[PDB]
């Protein structure tokens, strides 16, 4: 059977500010041949946003989101993937790590993930955080309490009927806390 066309992928998903991009990044550097692609890179241009009742800009949905690129982002991954280990004798099976906050909704890759994390953390330590962050544009007074925070839960709504196994994570232990506990995890998948 010709190798080369078989691949493993991680999905990281979880509410802001959890740790997931520094997550992605440190697992990568410890997994061969692993590339990482992050959903904030697919934010449609401000003025294809919408606002809502109240004038919040609706960022914290998929339609804010780019997702026809995202996947157009993961077939580049996989075809370059293909030519990532030359042919020899007989696998080593490329990785991608797609992370961001709003995955395990997205319909179309509800078949894609071959292991699933979710970072966690609860309202007072998230929007804690959050505040910490500068954002463009700037959160709102308001912001968090009018839109990320609601719009969260909706999603972990949406979560709690999924077709495949999630990993929930303490996203308040410390980075390297969490790259043990997931590395452990994975390496007895991969
Ligand atoms: N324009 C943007 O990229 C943007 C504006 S707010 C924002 C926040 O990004 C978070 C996901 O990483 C999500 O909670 C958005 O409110 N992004
Ligand atoms: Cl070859």
Same mark, same amino acid.
């Given at each position: 059977?010709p190798?080369g066309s078989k691949?493993? +992928? #991680?999905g990281?998903?979880?509410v802001? =500010?959890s740790g997931?991009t520094?997550?992605a990044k %440190?697992?990568?550097?410890? !997994? ?7 959903q904030?890179?697919?934010?449609k241009?401000?003025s294809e946003i ?16 780019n ?9 580049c ?5 293909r ?6 004798d ?6 991608? +790590? #797609?992370?961001?906050?709003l995955?395990? =909704? ?7 993930? %071959?292991?699933?994390?979710? !970072?966690?953390?609860?309202?007072e330590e998230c929007?804690?955080?959050?505040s910490?962050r500068?954002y463009?544009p ?10 990320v925070?609601?719009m969260?839960?909706?999603?972990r709504?949406?979560m709690?009927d999924?077709?495949?196994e999630?990993?929930?994570l303490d996203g ?7 790259f043990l506990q ?9």
């Amino acid at each position: 059977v010709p190798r080369g066309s078989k691949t493993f +992928i #991680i999905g990281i998903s979880g509410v802001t =500010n959890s740790g997931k991009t520094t997550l992605a990044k %440190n697992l990568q550097k410890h !997994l061969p041949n692993c590339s990482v692609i992050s959903q904030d890179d697919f934010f449609k241009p401000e003025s294809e946003i919408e606002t809502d009742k109240n004038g919040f800009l609706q960022y914290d949905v998929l339609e804010a989101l780019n997702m026809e690129k995202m996947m157009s982002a993961i077939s580049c991954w996989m075809e370059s993937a293909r030519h990532s280990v030359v042919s020899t004798d007989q696998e080593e099976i490329p990785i991608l +790590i #797609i992370e961001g906050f709003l995955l395990f =909704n997205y319909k179309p890759l509800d078949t894609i993930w %071959n292991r699933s994390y979710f !970072l966690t953390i609860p309202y007072e330590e998230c929007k804690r955080r959050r505040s910490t962050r500068v954002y463009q544009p700037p959160d709102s007074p308001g912001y968090f309490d009018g839109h990320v925070w609601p719009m969260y839960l909706k999603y972990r709504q949406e979560m709690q009927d999924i077709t495949w196994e999630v990993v929930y994570l303490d996203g308040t232990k410390s980075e390297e806390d969490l790259f043990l506990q997931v590395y452990e995890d994975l390496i007895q998948e991969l």
